[PDB]
């Protein structure tokens, strides 16, 4: 699977919801996240 978000046919509030789909979205945009780590310096440290 991957932590998918539903597509942008409903850009208002339903994009805040969550669903899982191990299909073709596992390469694509909606199954992508980011580790916006709180630390400023060494934010590109090896995360543990």
């Amino acid at each position: 699977e991957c932590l998918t978000v539903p597509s942008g046919e409903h850009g208002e509030e339903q994009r805040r919801t969550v669903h899982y789909e191990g299909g073709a979205v596992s390469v694509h945009a909606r199954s992508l996240w980011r580790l916006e780590t709180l630390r400023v310096a060494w934010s590109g440290s090896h995360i543990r």
Binding site: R34, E36, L38, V40, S43
Partner: protein, 72 residues
């Protein structure tokens, strides 16, 4: 990007990123007519790079901002 309010809202660190692509003394000046993990000295010429958007922030003819009315 205000990282002082890191707890109230996030800061976007990725857009703030910068990279030291090159650095030389001022005498390194040829004008067209590396070392590898060299150190960094004060007074030497520095080159920056915005990381994901490869736009080399550098000496450009920027004469657009007039908030102070004489400033680049």
């Amino acid at each position: 990007e205000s990282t002082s309010n890191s707890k109230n809202v996030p800061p976007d660190l990725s857009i703030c990123t910068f990279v030291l692509e090159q650095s030389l003394s001022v005498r390194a000046l040829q004008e067209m007519l590396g070392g590898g993990h060299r150190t960094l000295l004060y007074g030497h010429a520095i080159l920056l790079r915005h990381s994901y958007s490869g736009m080399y922030l550098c000496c450009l003819s920027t004469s657009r901002s007039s908030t102070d009315k004489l400033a680049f």
